[PDB]
Amino acid sequence: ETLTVHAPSPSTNLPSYGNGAFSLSAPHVPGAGPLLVQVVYSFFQSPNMCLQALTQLEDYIKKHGASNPLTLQIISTNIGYFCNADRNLVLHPGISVYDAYHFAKPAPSQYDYRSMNMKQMSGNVTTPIVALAHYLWGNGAERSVNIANIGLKISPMKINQIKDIIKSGVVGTFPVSTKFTHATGDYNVITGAYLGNITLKTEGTLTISANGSWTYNGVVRSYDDKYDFNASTHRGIIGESLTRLGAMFSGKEYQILLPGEIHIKESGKR
């Protein structure tokens, strides 16, 4: 049976991520000389910063035990840093992850889940740990992430209706209207962790030239209204970490809406 991690709050949080004993930063590269802020800044924008934070938690639980009260404080506190950074990304689209995580107000040591938690997630590299925060403390409340924020990369050759038109050898302009499964964890370790496989709808025009060059121009929206967050639906290496942690601690599954639409323009040659 699972242990309960208390929600982050100013009266319970540790004064620092990691109780100050470790921090989230770029990896040590022997022979590189001192680690400078440009390297850390780029690291914070990368998915590696999310895998690293989760690896730190799992390493800590293994060494010190999931039921050591300090382990539970480090989980509550560190995940609060991700929640605080993600709130700042939602409120300030356009800012870097390093700026949102380090220079936000209020201070991440003061993060209070009950009063501060947002229903919308940013879709940036902080999102998978925030999605875990909701399982631990959200009591089942529905969340959302806009589809424009999840880094979709659509491959029209992998969409049966479009693949069929291209392979048929036809030349001219053709309407497309189809649903298709899309495995975000085949290419996006962040989105794959909490949305995994999704189902999409696209409507558009496929133009194919006589030389076999083609362009697909179309709109993409989610087919399903929402997606379940549980141990089973996560995909990719960060999703595996989320699965191991959710097995250990109490929580409530919840659903994530995927509102919005994107416009895509993709090309290739037959």
DSSP letter at 10 equals T
DSSP character string of 36-84: -HHHHHHHHHSTHHHHHHHHHHHHHHHHH-TTSHHHHHHHHHHHHHHHH
Q: How many CB atoms lie within 10 A of CB 207?
A: 14
Cβ-based neighbours of 143, under 8 Å, separated by 6 or more:
119, 120, 121, 131, 134, 229, 254, 255, 256, 257
Q: What is the dihedral of CA 247, 251, 57, 90, to 10 degrees?
A: 130
ω before 106 within 30° of 0 (cis)? yes
Q: Is 182 exposed, middle or buried (0-12, 13-18, 19+ CB in 10 A)?
A: buried
- The three-state secondary structure class of 237 is helix
Q: How many CB atoms lie within 10 A of CB 222?
A: 21
Q: In whole angstroms, what is the distance from residue 5 CA to residue 74 CA?
A: 10
Q: In whole angstroms, what is the distance from residue 72 CA to residue 7 CA?
A: 10
Closest C-alpha among 128, 113, 110 to residue 244: 128
Closest C-alpha among 98, 89, 154 to residue 127: 89
- CA angle 189–224–238, rounded 5-degree value: 15
Residue listed under structure tokens 């509102």? 259
Q: Which two tokens stand for residue 263?
A: 């416009």
Residue listed under structure tokens 């040590």? 28
Residue listed under structure tokens 């699972």? 2
Cβ distance 130 to 8 under 8 Å?
no
Taken as a whole, the chain contains a residue count of: 270
Structure determination technique employed: X-ray
CA terminus-to-terminus distance, the chain: 55
Q: Which two tokens stand for residue 111?
A: 């993060």
The radius of gyration of the chain's CA atoms, rounded to the nearest angstrom, is 21
Q: What are the phi and psi torsion angles at 119 (to 5°)?
A: -75, -25
**Resolution value, angstrom units:** 1.7
CA neighbours closer than 13 Å in the CB half-sphere of residue 246: 27
- The three-state secondary structure class of 57 is helix
Q: Which domains does the chain have, with CATH numbers?
A: 1-140 (1.20.1440.280), 141-270 (3.30.450.400)
Residue 180 zone, left/alpha/beta (φ > 0; ψ -120 to 50; rest):
beta
